[PDB]
Amino acid sequence: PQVTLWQRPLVTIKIGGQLKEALLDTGADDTVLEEMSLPGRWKPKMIGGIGGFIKVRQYDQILIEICGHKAIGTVLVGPTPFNIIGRNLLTQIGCTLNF
Amino acid sequence: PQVTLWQRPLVTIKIGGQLKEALLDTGADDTVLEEMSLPGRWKPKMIGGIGGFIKVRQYDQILIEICGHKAIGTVLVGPTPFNIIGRNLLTQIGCTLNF
Ligand SMILES: O=C1N(Cc2ccc(CO)cc2)[C@H](Cc2ccccc2)[C@H](O)[C@@H](O)[C@@H](Cc2ccccc2)N1Cc1ccc(CO)cc1
Numbered sequence: 001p002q003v004t005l006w007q008r009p010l011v012t013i014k015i016g017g018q019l020k021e022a023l024l025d026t027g028a029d030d031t032v033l034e035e036m037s038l039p040g041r042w043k044p045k046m047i048g049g050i051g052g053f054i055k056v057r058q059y060d061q062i063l064i065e066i067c068g069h070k071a072i073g074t075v076l077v078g079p080t081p082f083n084i085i086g087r088n089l090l091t092q093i094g095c096t097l098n099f
Numbered sequence: 100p101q102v103t104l105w106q107r108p109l110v111t112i113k114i115g116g117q118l119k120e121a122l123l124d125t126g127a128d129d130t131v132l133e134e135m136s137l138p139g140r141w142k143p144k145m146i147g148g149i150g151g152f153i154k155v156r157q158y159d160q161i162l163i164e165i166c167g168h169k170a171i172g173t174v175l176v177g178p179t180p181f182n183i184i185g186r187n188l189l190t191q192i193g194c195t196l197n198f
Binding site: 001003004008009023024025026027028029032047048049050052053054067069080081084087090091093094095097098099 | 100101102103104105107108122123124125126127128131146147148149150151152153166168179180183186189190192193194195196197198
């Protein structure tokens with residue numbers, strides 16, 4: 001759809017059998033989710049944002065449905081204050097920015 | 100233009116007589132710029148991100164030209180790793196997200 005940016009761009013995702021909302025974030029390279037129960041094994045990683053860095057667990061080949069669209073990708077799960085869908089998934093659902 | 104997200108969406112801005120590049124960031128409510136010389140009054144502020152909180156100075160009513168569009172608004176100056184254009188200005192230049 002077209003989304004204007006007067007309000008935060010939030011969507012629903014289905015992840016790991018659970019429903020969340022997430023911010024669509026052109027500024028994030030990758031996707032970072034609040035702490036979840038995800039099946040399987042993972043690699044610890046660290047990412048930095050404003051303020052500093054967090055330690056995150058990386059899971060590869062995860063199915064996410066965002067709106068009706070499915071994608072498989074890496075997600076990082078960790079102590080973010082909310083769920084961020086970054087460019088690695090944003091390309092898969094064919095999202096563009098226009099002005 | 101329309102911009103795809105295989106690459107970080109960077110744009111050139113002019114602020115304060117200085118030329119910089121900035122990230123177009125739909126996840127950010129406000130614009131924060133790296134520390135840089137700006138004339139005027141300001142108020143102190145803190146913002147939170149992934150990682151933590153930073154202290155930032157707030158200037159209102161600052162003219163920025165982003166690509167070839169002029170916009171006027173609050174900018175927060177501070178210790179960010181990148182200059183971020185957030186939704187306060189993206190709305191002014193008509194930026195839309197589309198998928
Ligand atoms: O830290 C933020 N990251 C950090 C980040 C880094 C990496 C990933 C995964 O690869 C995900 C998120 C981005 C901006 C940024 C990029 C690179 C270096 C430094 C900063 C993000 O793109 C921006 O949207 C918000 C996302 C967000 C928003 C609110 C709370 C937590 C996270 N932030 C923080 C931010 C908050 C407020 C403003 C102004 O209102 C600006 C930025």
